């Protein structure tokens, strides 16, 4: 029911992205859940993980924290900004697919970029209608817009059109 | 028990072939069943296994998953397409076994690839009759189709002929 | 939860800088408070945390101490003087912001240097007033002192003014 | 001491040699006997010890088994035939001792190859008689078959005859 | 408690200087006292610490050791013998401090080296009078021997003069 | 009260010396004493440590063992012979000290080579008398044989003669 | 990916590692 | 004992190490 973080292999040096902060916070959560450390006994030991710029940052803001929840909220708030609405739409229409790229990677990326909008703002139909207008000419000359509905079918038609070529 | 996947060593990338995805799903299911983790608790921890492109794919479709069954269903449907029959028939009868490949390695692959056809459409006799048309001249000169009956004796006669 | 110093991985050499001594004293104190070691039992086993360059010094002055606070104060006195306030105020106004660093790193460093003054002498407003005189001309010509309402807002307006390609 | 196969570090691929399959089956059996896992519980979780080249084969023949002994016998039958006795006797008399190897390595290898015959068919004396016909001429011209009696003596006289620079 | 030295990280080689042997003996003694190992049980496990030449030396003289005290006595007697006085006095007055060395580093070494003389032969006054003849011109021009009394004020006046 | 040897870093490949076999047997003994494994539950797991030639050797002789003690005795017996009497005396007089070697290393080696004789066969006086006749000329021209007794003094005279030069 | 060269753990880079930087290594 | 190059424990040679030889490494 007690112990330090000194045994861990994870450390967060501070970089402004999403995947790194998410993976680090998840690993720290699994470690604290697995070794049984309690909530108020855990906050005192948190300093050992940071290094470089993160150590100076934690030395800065420290009296505003009081429990574990506030610490996670502060890290997430200062090291991964929430992008506003319009930048996502601007990023979405500035990158048409190239001749050398399978349908799967393109659809997966363009779908992963669309979930950051506030929930419930879009329907499957309107989103799929938005997705066209960027597919390269090799696929648009066969499948027609009024012969598809959900995302399960577009991948099917794309695979059959790919294997024939 | 220790109701989490934290101890697992298994992982999965973006590869596209039947074998890797099949062994991955089977290992995760057997690990879920042997160590006593609860049916519902595992779903919260599923995200710790994926890496690389698979993590982006999981970010793309979290809204549809609900319980433990539909997640494996989504994996098998997005990474395990039910191949249609004619491509399987074309892929079989290609690449006749070469002189070096042993009988056991050749038989196990050709039988593992024949299970993707729709269930119940073929009995043992026609299956063995299809398989007996690609073996090299070395194994065919001695055994003859009238001799072997079931799908097991062929391995025995092939092993005894391969001992020398 | 009985224990002692035997398992600790921290250690200290003979280096004569400042940051090393500060980080070492902080780590050792947080460890002693977290693992529950007795307030007097620790002094009987402190010798297991010294290299070969400071062990002779600890052997030379063992008898001029009686309780844990005096020993920590003695280490701080011999190996690195504590900073008085006026040197901190002198350092704060020396190097003005350059022409390339993003606002975030500047605010982080300045906040890191301002927590070493005694606590409670400076609330949020006067601190924001002291920090605002050194920003580079790219930011001072848009945002003004009329609306800041603490630090969280200044970083937000600076980020929106920085994404716009100046 | 409850447990299962989840923690085991041993594993087996698709290799078609003999020593690998033998060492693997021996390690897995000794582990199952040491940690006390139930005689039937192990069969429900054996699938966690196979690579990507043999997992398809295990998927293809799962239903032709019911208890642990049959599964081990099936692995041995498909991936590597067991050696019958006559091949062992054939291998024993092929390569006579060279002109440079020390007596110790020769006795160790010959004893290693003679334990695979069924137990109790050969006591110490006839084994010493079979081994004695292949020694190199440097040793046969001094020590004789009069006085050896047990394996322990032959190594001793060979070491004393080897230290003397032939 | 865990009556064995198995967890210790300390080690010892064949080096010949007072400092290494002193810190080694002190660390082993404090470890023996803090963790509660029995007075007699430690002797059976002492051989696991030595390495290199020291292991051969321990192989050479096991017959004479009996209890815990005589082992450390043998270590202190066969690696660092008590030095005779005249070599220590010659070591003293050699290597006058250079311009770069700070006052604290110079004072701690010169006092650590003066403790090997026979006990009780010198009081504080003559010791400080001996030490005050090797400091550079920089620290000597301001402080004067009539001012400082004990062995502590010299550090304070030296620090204030060294601040600038 | 149970466990395997799998979590160890020691392995014995088989080499005909003394120091290696001694250090390996000592490390295995400390490991078994520290993790609490019992005697008859420990013999079954011993196979995992050996590799290379040692594995074939253990595959050879196995039915002659029954408990832990017999296993240690067999390893010590087959992998580190006891030298008879005369070879030690022959080795002892075939290596006089060179001009470049301190007294300490020489006396330590020649003493370490003499303890393998059966115990109680020699007293300090006769051994120290045997030790002379090999010291190099730099030391024999000052200290005289009738001015020393125990080993504590010869090192003293050698050190004072060394520092003067 | 980028397995730590020294400790053989997938959690960081060469420059910074607990065994190498401190724990009285680099002797 | 000539620290293991890979695992960095003084217990063996480079050729033979539990993590490298087996434990599904060398991918
Ligand atoms: Zn590392
Ligand atoms: Zn290793």
Curated annotation (Swiss-Prot), chains G, H:
Disruption phenotype: Strong reduction in the number of synaptic boutons at neuromuscular junction in third-instar larvae.
Gene name of this polypeptide: Arc1
Subunit (UniProt): Homooligomer; homooligomerizes into virion-like capsids.
Organism of derivation: Drosophila melanogaster (Fruit fly)
Lineage: superkingdom: Eukaryota
Family: Belongs to the ARC/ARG3.1 family.
Described function: Master regulator of synaptic plasticity that self-assembles into virion-like capsids that encapsulate RNAs and mediate intercellular RNA transfer from motorneurons to muscles. Arc1 protein is released from motorneurons in extracellular vesicles that mediate the transfer of Arc1 mRNA into muscle cells, where Arc1 mRNA can undergo activity-dependent translation. Intercellular transfer od Arc1 mRNA is required for synaptic plasticity at the neuromuscular junction.
Expression triggers: Up-regulated following stimulation of E347 brain neurons.
Comment block on domains: The protein is evolutionarily related to retrotransposon Gag proteins. It contains structural elements found within viral Gag polyproteins originated from the Ty3/gypsy retrotransposon family and retains the ability to form virion-like capsid structures that can mediate mRNA transfer between cells. Tetrapod and fly Arc protein-coding genes originated independently from distinct lineages of Ty3/gypsy retrotransposons.
Known tissue expression: Expressed in a specific population of brain neurons, named E347, that are necessary and sufficient for proper body fat storage.
Full-protein residues shown: 224 to 250 of 254
Protein name, per record: Activity-regulated cytoskeleton associated protein 1
Location relative to the cell: Extracellular vesicle membrane; Synapse
